[PDB]
């Protein structure tokens, strides 16, 4: 699975000293592009993208997102009028991109949200814009009569994919690397309860399975994951806890399944 | 690798 993802937010309330429009690009979860309404320029966010592109590329990308900023500026006015609202805290969100699956087949998305709730989604197959809400019906007729569906189908199926294949090749050293996590497991006692905590520090790539074992057997009872959260250096962290009976510290182990490990790693307190 | 058509953002 390979993914190219463009996500952008137009805000009424960023707020103080922060940009109202922020647009960012993602290749396989990795941030490579940034645009904001203050700077008014599209900038690289990784070393692998900056080394493989000239300023002729970035000026061209700047012209596109500057247009996208002004469209989403007016969208804030339009949808507040659509919902009969004045001022306040409001957001327009866009999610655009394409997938190259393990199958070798291509998925494509271009969908929006108003105030964190699904507004419209483009159907690549039928070449129509789906309206998730009754207030999104006037958007549907405006968008389809604009005739954007023709070009957007071609972009998501061809142009987006061509760029993504090129980006995967540009940043192969970073995207294909394997980083082994330093794993620790800690025990703490609250009120009449032992809570055990497992932490995987600094792993890449993102996919990871972290399970608890009691006497060898896998336990999901009173287990909780904090998901996969990022570090500042492009590596990942994950935090998994389990509630247990007091005294049972030596019974528990933390099973880590990751690409950097040829066999699963077990860790104890 | 953005699309030339930024009008596709119209709501």
């Amino acid at each position: 699975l390979h993914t190219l993802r463009y996500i952008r937010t137009a805000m009424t309330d960023p707020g103080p000293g922060l940009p109202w429009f922020v647009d960012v690009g993602y290749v396989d979860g990795e941030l490579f592009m940034h645009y904001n309404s203050t700077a008014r320029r599209a900038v690289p966010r990784t070393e692998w993208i900056a080394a493989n592109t000239d300023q002729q590329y970035w000026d061209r990308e700047t012209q596109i997102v500057q247009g996208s900023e002004q469209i989403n500026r007016e969208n804030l006015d339009i949808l507040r009028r659509r919902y009969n609202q004045t001022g306040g805290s409001h957001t327009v969100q866009w999610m655009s991109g394409c997938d190259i699956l393990e199958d070798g087949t291509i998925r494509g998305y271009h969908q929006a949200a108003y105030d964190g709730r699904d507004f419209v989604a483009f159907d690549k197959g039928t070449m129509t814009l789906t309206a998730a809400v009754p207030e999104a019906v006037p958007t549907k007729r405006k968008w389809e009569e604009g005739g954007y569906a023709e070009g957007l189908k071609q972009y998501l199926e061809e142009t987006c994919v061509e760029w993504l294949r090129r980006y995967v090749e540009y940043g192969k050293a970073e995207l294909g690397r394997r980083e082994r996590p330093e794993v620790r497991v800690w025990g703490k006692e609250a009120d009449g309860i032992l809570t055990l905590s497992c932490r995987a520090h600094g792993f890449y790539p993102r996919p990871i399975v972290v399970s608890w074992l009691k006497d060898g057997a896998v336990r999901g009872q009173d287990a909780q994951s904090g998901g996969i959260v990022p570090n500042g250096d492009g590596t990942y962290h994950t935090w998994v806890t389990i509630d247990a009976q007091p005294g049972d510290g030596d019974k528990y182990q933390c099973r880590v399944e990751h690409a950097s490990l040829p066999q699963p790693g077990l860790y104890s307190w | 690798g953005r699309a030339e058509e930024y009008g596709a953002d119209t709501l």
């Binding site: 964190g116 620790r184 600094g202 959260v229 | -």
Partner: protein, 98 residues
Amino acid sequence: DLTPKVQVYSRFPASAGTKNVLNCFAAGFHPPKISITLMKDGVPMEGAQYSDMSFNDDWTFQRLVHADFTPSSGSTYACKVEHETLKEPQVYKWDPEF
């Protein structure tokens, strides 16, 4: 309107006197306007890098804040989060041994 889900964690397994990075990750919140501050014993931490604003598949906003630090023993490291859904500011303590 959704409350922020906050996690505080070091980059490396922590020990007193070893160079590390303190991360505060707020997630699952709306609206996007947020104040996130990394703190040591009631003092804001120097050289905090604010990573770009992102959001998950459910549209809900997320932000990473990270700062280079050398953890001292007996110190309290914490993350202070201020959001519209919260009445009082919320302080999420970091445990080096949890």
